[PDB]
Amino acid sequence: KHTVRAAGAVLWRDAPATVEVAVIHRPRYDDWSLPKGKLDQGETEPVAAAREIHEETGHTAVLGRRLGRVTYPIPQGTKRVWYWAAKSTGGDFSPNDEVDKLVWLPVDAAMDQLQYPDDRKVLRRFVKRPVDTKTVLVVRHGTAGRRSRYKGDDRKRPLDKRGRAQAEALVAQLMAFGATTLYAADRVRCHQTIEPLAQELDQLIHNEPLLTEEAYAADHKAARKRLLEIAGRPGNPVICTQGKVIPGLIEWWCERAKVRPETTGNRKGSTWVLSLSDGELVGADYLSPPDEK
């Protein structure tokens, strides 16, 4: 009944399924499995997955597509593990008492090495779609108090204390996907959400008047074409906008690409990870706000 939250990865490298994936052995359990671990206080699942990859395998990585959820019973209640595809960006494994072996295997061989049926289902998802993906990160701005009850939008209303903390927490989450470039709708609260990331990257935030609530309602087509324009540029863009805009854009793109999101939501501080392969949408993964389950 109590849930223990964890995250892990299919860590891959170049040798389509030409790639090799990492499978680890743990002496405590005598098991062969995918790297994973429990979320620390304040972490979200992507942050934990990236950290655990580095701690268990020695590799840095960039997360891509989400690969589903595993649950199993434990004395504490239920363990829940979300998985990501993760491209290695280098490193070296050193055997130790917690993880004593790491093998790099083609997917078919890794399938045989993995002992847990639900790890094998994660690996089957991994191979269903391309893995060398670029990433568009669509973020609903953080909490920013409430609009006045007179009909309309407020341009300058800032994040509240909670929302500032969400913005700070988003840095590690968005970095986990290799965010490179920053865009925000023409509202203060949208810029403030990604300001911490902007400081981390030392990047400017490109202002997007076409992506506000009012602009989307006046001209949804221009908003859609702007999203595609941004997505088409080199790098992995973060686009921070508003609640009336995101569901429509995501639904539209998923529908025309025939992509099924495994989770849905639209909470302030949430992120949609849109995975692209040669311009085609291949994944749409809704991440909860950093301070919500």
Ligand X SMILES: Nc1ncnc2c1ncn2[C@@H]1O[C@H](COP(=O)(O)OP(=O)(O)OP(=O)(O)O)[C@@H](O)[C@H]1O
Q: Which residues lie near Mg ion (CB under 5 A)? A: 37
Residues 247-286 that bind ligand X (CB under 6 A): none
Burial class (CB in 10 A: 0-12, 13-18, 19+), 189: buried
Rule CB under 6 A: say whether 118 interacts with ligand X: yes
Among Mg ion, ligand X, none, residue 18 binds (CB under 5-8 Å by kind): none
Compare residues 37 and 178 and give the one whose CB is closer to ligand X.
37
Closest approach of Mg ion to the CB of residue 34, in Å: 9
Residue 134 among known ligand-binding residues: no
Residue 38 among known ligand-binding residues: yes
Angle between helices 161-176 and 188-201 (to 10 degrees): 50
Compare residues 155 and 225 and give the one whose CB is closer to ligand X.
155
Stretch that binds ligand X, among 59-67, 82-90, 138-146, 248-256 (CB under 6 A): 138-146
Among the listed residues 160, 200, 213, 291, the single contact to ligand X using CB under 6 A:
213
Rule CB under 6 A: say whether 152 interacts with ligand X: yes
Secondary structure letter of residue 236 according to DSSP: -
Structure tokens at 31: 């098991």
Stretch that binds ligand X, among 14-22, 66-74, 166-174, 257-265 (CB under 6 A): 66-74
Q: Dihedrals φ, ψ of 92, to 5°?
A: -145, 130
Compare residues 79 and 220 and give the one whose CB is closer to ligand X.
79
Alpha carbon distance 293, 12 (integer Å): 28
User: Residues 6 or more apart from 127 whose CB is under 8 A from it?
Assistant: 17, 107
Under DSSP, is residue 137 helix (H, G, I), strand (E, B) or coil?
A: strand
CA dihedral 183, 189, 193, 198 (to 10 degrees): 50
Burial class (CB in 10 A: 0-12, 13-18, 19+), 146: exposed
Rule CB under 6 A: say whether 242 interacts with ligand X: yes
Q: Which residues are annotated as a binding site?
A: 26-29, 31, 36-38, 52, 56, 72, 79, 98, 116
Q: Which residues bind ligand X (CB under 6 A)?
A: 6, 29, 31, 33, 36-38, 70, 72, 74, 79, 116, 118-119, 140, 144, 146-152, 189, 213, 242-244
